[PDB]
Design an enzyme around this catalytic site. Structure first.
Site, PDB file in Angstrom:
ATOM      1  N   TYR A  81      52.499  31.300  31.551  1.00  0.00           N
ATOM      2  CA  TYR A  81      52.710  31.683  32.937  1.00  0.00           C
ATOM      3  C   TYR A  81      53.912  30.947  33.507  1.00  0.00           C
ATOM      4  O   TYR A  81      54.279  29.860  33.051  1.00  0.00           O
ATOM      5  CB  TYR A  81      51.469  31.386  33.789  1.00  0.00           C
ATOM      6  CG  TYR A  81      51.195  29.909  33.973  1.00  0.00           C
ATOM      7  CD1 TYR A  81      50.496  29.187  33.015  1.00  0.00           C
ATOM      8  CD2 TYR A  81      51.636  29.238  35.104  1.00  0.00           C
ATOM      9  CE1 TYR A  81      50.244  27.839  33.179  1.00  0.00           C
ATOM     10  CE2 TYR A  81      51.392  27.891  35.275  1.00  0.00           C
ATOM     11  CZ  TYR A  81      50.695  27.196  34.311  1.00  0.00           C
ATOM     12  OH  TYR A  81      50.448  25.853  34.482  1.00  0.00           O
TER      13      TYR A  81
ATOM     14  N   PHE B  90      57.709  26.847  41.463  1.00  0.00           N
ATOM     15  CA  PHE B  90      57.018  25.571  41.555  1.00  0.00           C
ATOM     16  C   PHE B  90      56.348  25.141  40.262  1.00  0.00           C
ATOM     17  O   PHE B  90      55.983  23.966  40.142  1.00  0.00           O
ATOM     18  CB  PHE B  90      55.958  25.610  42.669  1.00  0.00           C
ATOM     19  CG  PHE B  90      54.692  26.319  42.279  1.00  0.00           C
ATOM     20  CD1 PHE B  90      54.625  27.701  42.297  1.00  0.00           C
ATOM     21  CD2 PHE B  90      53.567  25.605  41.905  1.00  0.00           C
ATOM     22  CE1 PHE B  90      53.463  28.357  41.944  1.00  0.00           C
ATOM     23  CE2 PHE B  90      52.402  26.255  41.551  1.00  0.00           C
ATOM     24  CZ  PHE B  90      52.351  27.633  41.570  1.00  0.00           C
ATOM     25  N   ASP B  91      56.172  26.044  39.301  1.00  0.00           N
ATOM     26  CA  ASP B  91      55.510  25.711  38.048  1.00  0.00           C
ATOM     27  C   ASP B  91      55.902  26.739  36.999  1.00  0.00           C
ATOM     28  O   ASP B  91      56.187  27.895  37.321  1.00  0.00           O
ATOM     29  CB  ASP B  91      53.986  25.670  38.213  1.00  0.00           C
ATOM     30  CG  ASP B  91      53.279  25.134  36.985  1.00  0.00           C
ATOM     31  OD1 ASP B  91      53.966  24.636  36.067  1.00  0.00           O
ATOM     32  OD2 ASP B  91      52.033  25.209  36.936  1.00  0.00           O
TER      33      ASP B  91
ATOM     34  N   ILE C 240      42.494  27.257  38.713  1.00  0.00           N
ATOM     35  CA  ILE C 240      42.225  27.825  40.028  1.00  0.00           C
ATOM     36  C   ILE C 240      41.583  29.203  39.888  1.00  0.00           C
ATOM     37  O   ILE C 240      41.752  29.915  38.888  1.00  0.00           O
ATOM     38  CB  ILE C 240      43.504  27.889  40.879  1.00  0.00           C
ATOM     39  CG1 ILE C 240      44.673  28.433  40.058  1.00  0.00           C
ATOM     40  CG2 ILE C 240      43.838  26.517  41.442  1.00  0.00           C
ATOM     41  CD1 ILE C 240      45.952  28.592  40.851  1.00  0.00           C
TER      42      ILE C 240
ATOM     43  N   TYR D  14      44.444  27.375  46.926  1.00  0.00           N
ATOM     44  CA  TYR D  14      44.408  25.968  47.307  1.00  0.00           C
ATOM     45  C   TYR D  14      43.776  25.692  48.662  1.00  0.00           C
ATOM     46  O   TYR D  14      43.490  24.526  48.949  1.00  0.00           O
ATOM     47  CB  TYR D  14      45.825  25.376  47.291  1.00  0.00           C
ATOM     48  CG  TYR D  14      46.282  24.944  45.916  1.00  0.00           C
ATOM     49  CD1 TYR D  14      45.784  23.789  45.330  1.00  0.00           C
ATOM     50  CD2 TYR D  14      47.207  25.693  45.204  1.00  0.00           C
ATOM     51  CE1 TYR D  14      46.196  23.392  44.072  1.00  0.00           C
ATOM     52  CE2 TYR D  14      47.627  25.303  43.946  1.00  0.00           C
ATOM     53  CZ  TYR D  14      47.118  24.152  43.386  1.00  0.00           C
ATOM     54  OH  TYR D  14      47.532  23.762  42.135  1.00  0.00           O
TER      55      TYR D  14
ATOM     56  N   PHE E 156      52.265  34.415  39.976  1.00  0.00           N
ATOM     57  CA  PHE E 156      52.336  33.946  38.598  1.00  0.00           C
ATOM     58  C   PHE E 156      52.706  35.094  37.672  1.00  0.00           C
ATOM     59  O   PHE E 156      52.088  36.161  37.721  1.00  0.00           O
ATOM     60  CB  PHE E 156      51.006  33.331  38.155  1.00  0.00           C
ATOM     61  CG  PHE E 156      50.545  32.194  39.017  1.00  0.00           C
ATOM     62  CD1 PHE E 156      51.024  30.913  38.808  1.00  0.00           C
ATOM     63  CD2 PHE E 156      49.625  32.403  40.029  1.00  0.00           C
ATOM     64  CE1 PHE E 156      50.602  29.864  39.597  1.00  0.00           C
ATOM     65  CE2 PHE E 156      49.198  31.356  40.822  1.00  0.00           C
ATOM     66  CZ  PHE E 156      49.687  30.086  40.605  1.00  0.00           C
TER      67      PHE E 156
END
Lengths: 756, 107, 386, 315
Positions: B26, B36-37, B56, B82, B99
């Site tokens: 991902y 961010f990731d 999550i 979140y 994602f």
């Protein structure tokens, strides 16, 4: 494009400063922020920025420092902390480096071979944010160490190749920006336990060949070069110590069986004589350290030398090999040559660089100084307790990191957990010498002084941290016989702030005064070495407590008695532990404490000494009345009557134990007679028997926080050690008045027994 | 709050079930496209169990609707990813995540 | 202990007044302290009389005099040159430390703070001019700048001064948002945080949030970042609370500071074909072509393989079609002068819009695309696999 | 335990000699400023840096020992004297006298290893009648009018070490029954006899030649605001050590048996008193009327009466 910032002076400077901010926000062992910063910049953008030949140079240095701080600085600092501690196991791999090749025309390369030494385990957690409630995120973010190693090796080769030809546009700008970050990354990589023999050979193939030390490098480059060479010599000293331990294992293995064989031979062919019992006493006594000192001395013609001369040849050969491996009569020669050449080339600025260069040259020319400084710190343990020692070293490293960072709630909790771990590590019991060599007590004392700094009597910041520290120190002094001496030096300090932690009957253990008492307790040598630069301080504290009201009970609601009996009890207990050791009264300490107590009369109770209260009888009767009447207390609590009774009992016990002797030396010494007369004038005899005769109630259970028979026990001790029982009149009088009712109350017991 | 937009089909025959450690690839990003990731940055996949409450909800309940070798765009919602507090430091409060979930292998 | 001396008739033989010559450096320093405190008390009285209410202008308001006094005091507390002899530099450092200690032990920092407050009660130079006059309203800015510079110089090197006056950090950070003396307040804050570790213990979350708001309002200034670095690490030790506060309140949304990314290089290829329309001579306004793909990896190294196809316009009838400059992440459809398609979305102005299609997917291998274009009434269109 | 014994008594038994060659190839101007001169300047700047307490400075403590150990029938005596003068010149023309003066002045009168090392270096640099180094030190102290060096010397002489009887009695009581350590470290009775003799030998070498100027400067520091009488400090320390030796004799008066510990303590006291007496002789030698009157108007007479008493009785 990030490379376009070469012309823009505002964005370049702002990004350099934001990289410095990224570095400083997680510089120390703060991993919760690095776990965010890694993704805040990137995983591979760091590699791209450190690889790109076109960089402004400020951004290059910033990205290098950021990578170091967020991926390697934690373990690098851990290794630098636990780098001077040479903890060795006893596995068969340690006995594989007994050769340490120095003969047959070879010296070897620094860092090549076997480590077989206790080192902190490295591990890096994988940065993942979709994983909710990560386990600890405490170790570090993960990085491709092998890819970084290959990249930095090839880039160092390219950089030295570019610098050899003296181009007009080095990478990032000046040769400083070209070399300093790259060599810093290489240095921290070599530190953090990578670059195995294969890659270390190629690494040496650009500084060793007789290169990088021959170029005209500026000051910040040769500084990193000096640090690199200092590490290259530290690992050489470590290899020397490893070989020393490897040979020492077999040597002592042979020597122990040799001495046991000679002892058995003596036992067989005893041939009973006068010197046979002397040799027997020499073998029984003279503990192993003195035994080793006696059996290891042969450098002159003839001296105290045992029978095994065959192993002396092996020991001399090993010592000669050690001396020819040391600096005495090529790496050390090359380092010294480079240092003197750098010093002769031109006048050098950067006094830090000058100091680094000169200490490197000095240690290279000395050689044996490193050994004589590091052998007191080396220690071999076993091949069975390696995991326990690894856990202990990890906990000590965590404690050191928390000491480095500032103190807070989370830091205090982590330090308490680490103290618990090192107390329950099961190796603290077995190897106290290893603890003293690592210096755990020193780090705990530094933590304690950092916690105590800031306030003297107003407020002690971060409570219970000094408590856990004092408890650890108490246990450390308790399980030992020489660590008490090692801690006795800090006693002179902690006696100054021993007033903290008192006036609170919740910590009968952890306290600075209690750790002083634990260091002095059960050691005649320490009790004698305890001179009087601090007994007068303890007496001054006792006088202050007996005069003031401690300003702590009035806030809780106590009736504000004109003297404090909760701190006086602790002061008298410390004085008792310092004056009475192993069952005998220390003469000089007793004399000097008696002198101080008679020069300062307010140290005694106001109802016992002074123009006010009559004496100990009325004092203790008033104390019992106050204990019975709850209107004079604080509305687990401090019973004021019981506190006064315990204070007076502790004072009487201190006086009885500081009495001259059991008349052994008093029968011939006049100073003892004067001290006994002073004690008798202080405390009368009728007073003593009256306070003895109280006939405490014997109960349906009751409370043991009132008038307990320990007071009358202290009174009996004082009477025995001061007045004694020698005349039939007084003997029978005491037996009739004080002893008979107490014996009857103790005999009146069938099943319900709660007061032992 | 969890959805899925197919970017590349994955034969639609093999699907993850409860009690398996699936291998995922991902690359996350915020609503405005700010990344961010990611997982292709560190060159290693992401092995996670379905129904073990470790990743999550917006990720697991969206990956439970994919096929082996399938690429999808999973959109989230703050209350499912979140919450009103977000991830301290990296994710702002009330942030919609996106994602690019590529399924690698099924275990 | 205060043994008050009394002049009596008898006297005792125990006085013993020994002398110390009060070195000329300290004597001159004390005389400067006296002159400065006198002038500053005069200025404070004048400014207070002007501020409490309207009064007669026949008052002592020495604007140029206090300006010259500040210009002299800044040079008095000026640090020594780094390019000087070592021993002389150390002597000048000791002299500066002595001057700072003598100024602190006589209550000068609080006097400077009172002056700064009485100058900050006014909002702007125009607001101060109509109250004090033309020259005063013009020199108020310079006087405030010089006062803040002197306040910074009084604590630049010394440590006891910062450890003593650190209680005024709340006032400093509250005045930080005056929009006028931001540089001076920030320099004072940096020089008080870099030396005194006691100051970091009284910096709460509100102060850090106000500093980050200053960074968000006044723009990109590296002094703010230096102050944040000093707050994170003071002297070889880290403050975990301050570091966490910085990480939480500085980069949660990534808009406070610059961002970075690692993007791919894309190139735009085209045949030597131009399609323009006008009145009269036209080109039938209808064109079409096809497209196939041999091999296409989904992710070459780290990111999604950029692959779009479409039609790009030009600047009227000239070459150099749309795009930012070159070499960027701007392929086709990333601007208003281009319209592209990537398999799943439509790109027009760097804004992808999703579409629906049977078996919708990116431009994978063995994908047949067909691009048609009508120019007058309709626009471009794409057909995937027919 | 074997490794500890090996570290203790196998390696540090004088197994190297490198100070002379090190100083030589550090003073060799390979080509400016020599490396030894750079190191001396570094130490001088470190000592001149304004601080509140002299740091440990392992570098200085390790290099002062080297620079001190580098230094040291008529023709051979003259030749070895010339060689000593040559070595002193080699390691003092770069400003080592000023370095020693600054290191002594930057201690505030605190006895420590830094002060011990700098006193050893001063001794090794003033060995013999070296007048060049004495003139350099005097010119430095006159051009930089400082009382810090003199007050540091006064504090060191006032708090160096004095023989005490309480610690000796406690040590005897401890060794009477405690056999756990045997107290092989015979300390706490005369703390630093080496340091005391080194300080007083440094003073003796400062006044070695009949330097009337230096002998008067050690008494009345003309040009400075406050002056301290090193002569008075020395005679006071002599009185103190005389009282200490008298008390030690009163202790060892009656048993007529002197154990090894008592003999060693007496030998250390005799060495310290002999060094103090030699320093006083170097102070008063020559027609130094000032120092002669200073010693004649002090308690030196009581000190010498006590010394004659203990001499007669102990002999």
């Amino acid at each position: 494009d990030i490379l376009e910032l070469t012309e823009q002076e505002e964005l370049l400077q702002f990004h350099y400063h934001t990289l410095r901010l990224y570095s400083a926000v997680c510089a120390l062992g703060n991993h919760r922020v690095a776990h965010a910063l890694c993704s805040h910049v990137d995983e591979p953008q760091l590699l791209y920025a450190i690889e790109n030949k076109y960089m402004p140079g400020l951004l290059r240095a910033g990205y290098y420092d950021l990578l170091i701080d967020i991926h390697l600085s934690s373990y690098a600092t851990a290794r630098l902390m636990m780098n001077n501690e040479f903890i060795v196991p006893m596995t068969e791999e340690t006995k594989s480096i007994t050769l340490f090749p120095d003969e047959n025309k070879k010296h070897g390369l620094p860092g090549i071979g076997l480590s077989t030494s206790l080192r902190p385990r490295m591990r890096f957690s994988s940065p993942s944010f979709v994983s909710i409630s990560n386990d600890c995120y405490q170790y570090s973010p993960e990085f491709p160490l092998d890819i970084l190693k290959a990249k930095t090796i090839q880039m160092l080769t390219e950089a030295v190749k570019e610098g050899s030809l003296h181009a007009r546009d080095p990478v990032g700008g000046t040769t400083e920006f070209l070399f300093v970050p790259l060599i810093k990354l290489f240095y921290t990589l070599l530190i953090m336990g990578i670059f195995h023999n294969e890659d270390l050979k190629h690494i040496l193939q650009l500084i060793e060949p007789s290169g990088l030390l021959q170029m005209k490098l500026p000051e910040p480059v040769k500084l990193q070069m000096c640090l690199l060479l200092q590490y290259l010599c530290d690992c050489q000293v470590r290899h020397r110590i490893e070989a020393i331990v490897a040979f020492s294992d077999d040597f002592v293995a042979k020597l122990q069986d040799n001495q046991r064989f000679r002892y058995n031979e003596v036992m067989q062919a005893l041939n009973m004589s006068a010197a046979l019992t002397a040799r027997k006493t020499r073998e029984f006594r003279s503990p192993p350290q003195e035994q080793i000192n006696m059996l290891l001395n042969f450098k002159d013609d003839k001296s105290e030398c045992p029978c095994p001369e065959e192993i002396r040849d092996q020991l001399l050969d090993f010592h000669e090999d050690l001396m020819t491996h040391c600096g005495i009569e090529s790496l050390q020669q090359l380092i010294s040559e480079t240092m003197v050449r750098w010093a002769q080339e031109s006048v050098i600025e950067d006094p830090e660089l000058v100091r680094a260069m000169f200490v490197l040259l000095h240690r290279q020319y000395d050689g044996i100084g490193g050994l004589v400084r590091a052998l007191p710190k080396t220690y071999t343990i076993n091949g069975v307790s390696v995991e326990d020692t690894i856990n202990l070293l990890a906990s000590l490293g965590q404690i050191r990191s928390l000491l480095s960072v500032r103190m807070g709630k989370e830091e205090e909790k982590l330090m308490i957990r680490g103290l618990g771990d090192i107390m329950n590590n099961k190796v603290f019991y077995q190897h106290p010498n290893l603890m003293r060599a690592l210096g755990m007590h020193e780090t705990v004392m530094e933590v304690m002084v950092n916690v105590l700094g800031g306030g003297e009597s107003k407020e002690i910041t971060f409570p219970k941290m000094v408590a856990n520290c004092c408890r650890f120190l108490c246990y450390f002094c308790r399980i030992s016989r020489q660590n008490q001496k090692a801690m006795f030096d800090h006693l002179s300090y902690l006696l100054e702030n021993s007033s903290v932690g008192l006036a609170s009957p919740a910590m009968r253990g952890s306290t600075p005064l209690d750790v002083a008492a634990a260091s002095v307790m059960d050691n005649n040598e320490l009790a004698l070495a305890l001179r009087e630069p601090d007994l007068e301080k303890v007496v001054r504290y006792l006088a202050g407590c007996g005069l003031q009201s401690c300003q702590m009970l009035v806030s809780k609601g106590y009736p504000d008695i004109g003297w404090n009996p909760v701190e006086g009890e602790r002061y008298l207990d410390f004085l008792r532990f310092a004056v009475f050791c192993n069952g005998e009264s220390v003469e000089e300490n007793a004399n000097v404490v008696v002198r101080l107590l008679i020069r300062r009369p307010e140290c005694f109770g106001p109802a016992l000494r002074g123009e006010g209260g009559n004496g100990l009888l009325a004092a203790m009767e008033e104390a019992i009345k106050i204990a019975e009447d709850p209107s004079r207390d604080g509305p687990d609590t401090i019973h004021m009557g019981n506190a006064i009774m315990t204070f007076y009992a502790a004072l009487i016990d201190l006086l009885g134990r500081c009495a001259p002797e059991m008349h052994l030396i008093h029968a011939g010494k006049g100073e003892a007679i004067r001290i006994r007369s002073i004690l008798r004038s202080l405390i009368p005899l009728g007073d003593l028997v009256g306070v003895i005769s109280i006939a405490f109630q014997m109960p349906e259970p009751d409370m043991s926080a009132g008038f307990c028979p320990d007071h009358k026990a202290a009174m009996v001790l004082f009477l025995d050690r001061v007045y004694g029982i020698e005349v039939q009149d007084f003997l029978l009088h005491l037996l009739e008045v004080g002893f008979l009712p107490d014996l009857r109350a103790a005999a009146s017991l069938d099943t319900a027994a709660l007061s032992x | 709050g969890v959805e899925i937009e197919t970017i590349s089909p994955g034969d639609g025959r093999t699907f993850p079930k409860k009690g398996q450690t699936c291998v995922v690839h991902y690359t996350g990003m915020l609503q405005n496209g700010k990344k961010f990731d990611s997982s292709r940055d560190r060159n290693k996949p992401f092995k996670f169990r379905i129904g073990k409450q470790e990743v999550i909800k917006g990720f697991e309940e969206g990956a439970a609707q994919m096929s082996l070798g399938q690429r999808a765009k999973l959109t989230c919602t703050p209350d499912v990813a979140y919450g009103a507090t977000g991830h301290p430091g990296v994710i702002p409060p009330n942030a919609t995540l996106i994602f690019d979930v590529e399924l690698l292998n099924l275990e | 202990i205060q043994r008050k001396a009394i002049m009596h008739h008898e006297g005792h033989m125990d006085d013993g007044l020994n002398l110390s010559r009060s070195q000329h450096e300290e004597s001159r320093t004390a005389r400067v302290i006296r002159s400065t405190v006198f002038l500053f008390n005069r200025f404070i009285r004048g400014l207070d009389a002007l501020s409490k209410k309207v009064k007669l202008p026949t008052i002592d308001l020495p604007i140029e005099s206090v300006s010259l006094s500040l210009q002299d005091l800044i040079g008095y507390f000026h640090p020594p040159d780094e390019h000087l002899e070592h021993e002389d530099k150390q002597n000048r450092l000791r002299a500066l430390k002595n001057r700072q200690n003598l100024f602190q032990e006589e209550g000068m920092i609080n006097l400077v703070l009172e002056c700064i407050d009485r100058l900050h009660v006014y909002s702007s130079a125009a607001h101060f001019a109509d109250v004090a006059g033309r020259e005063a309203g013009e020199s108020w800015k310079s006087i405030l700048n010089s006062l803040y510079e002197l306040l910074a110089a009084l604590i630049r090197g010394n440590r006891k001064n910062c450890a003593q006056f650190s209680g005024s950090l709340d006032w400093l950070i509250s005045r930080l948002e005056r929009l006028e003396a931001s540089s001076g307040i920030l320099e004072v804050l940096h020089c008080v945080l870099v030396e005194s570790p006691e100051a970091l213990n009284i910096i709460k979350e509100g102060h850090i949030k106000s500093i980050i708001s200053l960074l968000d309002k006044h723009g990109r200034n590296h002094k703010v970042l230096d102050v944040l670095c000093s707050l994170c690490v003071c002297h070889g030790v880290a403050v975990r609370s301050n570091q966490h506060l910085i990480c939480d309140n500085l980069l949660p949304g990534r808009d406070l500071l610059l961002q970075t990314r690692l993007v791919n290089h894309v190139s735009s290829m085209r045949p030597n074909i131009f399609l323009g329309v006008s009145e009269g001579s036209a080109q039938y306004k209808k064109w079409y072509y096809e497209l196939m793909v041999d091999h296409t990896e989904p992710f070459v190294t780290a990111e999604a393989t950029h692959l779009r196809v479409g039609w790009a316009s030009t600047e009227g009838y000239s070459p150099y079609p749309g795009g930012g400059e070159e070499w960027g992440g701007n392929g086709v459809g990333d601007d208003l002068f281009s319209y592209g398609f990537d398999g799943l979305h439509l790109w027009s102005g760097c804004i992808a819009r999703t579409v629906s299609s049977p078996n919708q997917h990116l431009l994978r291998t063995d994908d047949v695309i067909s691009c048609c274009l009508d120019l007058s009434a309709p626009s471009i269109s794409f057909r995937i696999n027919g | 335990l074997f490794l500890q014994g090996y570290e203790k008594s196998w390696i540090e038994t004088e197994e190297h000699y490198f100070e002379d060659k090190l100083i030589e190839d550090l003073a060799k101007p390979g080509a400016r400023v020599d490396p030894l001169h750079q190191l001396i300047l570094l130490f001088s700047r470190t000592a001149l840096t304004e601080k509140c307490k002299l740091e440990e400075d392992f570098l200085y403590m390790a290099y002062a020992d080297i620079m001190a150990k580098s230094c040291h029938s008529f023709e051979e005596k003259e030749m070895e004297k010339q060689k000593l003068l040559y070595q002193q010149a080699r390691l003092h023309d770069r400003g080592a006298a000023e370095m020693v003066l600054q290191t002594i002045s930057a201690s505030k009168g605190e006895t420590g290893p830094m002060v011990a090392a700098t006193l050893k270096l001063g001794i090794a640099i003033l060995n013999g009648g070296n007048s060049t180094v004495q003139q350099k030190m005097l010119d430095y102290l006159k051009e930089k009018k400082d009382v810090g060096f003199f007050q540091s010397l006064a504090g060191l002489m006032q708090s160096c070490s004095v023989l005490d009887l309480n610690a000796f009695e406690r040590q005897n009581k401890a060794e009477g029954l405690g056999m756990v350590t045997e107290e092989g470290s015979g300390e706490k009775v005369l703390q630093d006899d080496e340091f005391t003799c080194d300080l007083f030998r440094f003073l003796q070498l400062l006044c070695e030649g009949h330097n009337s100027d230096f002998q008067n400067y050690l008494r009345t520091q003309t040009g400075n605001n406050t002056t301290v009488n090193i002569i008075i400090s020395t005679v006071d320390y002599l009185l103190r050590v005389q009282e200490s030796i008298s008390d030690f004799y009163w202790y060892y008066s009656g048993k007529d048996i002197i154990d090894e510990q008592g003999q060693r303590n007496f030998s250390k006291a005799i060495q310290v008193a002999k060094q103090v007496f030699n320093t006083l002789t170097e102070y008063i030698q020559g027609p130094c009327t000032g120092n002669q009157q200073s010693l004649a108007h002090s308690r030196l007479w009581d000190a010498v009466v006590g010394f004659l008493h203990v001499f007669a009785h102990m002999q």
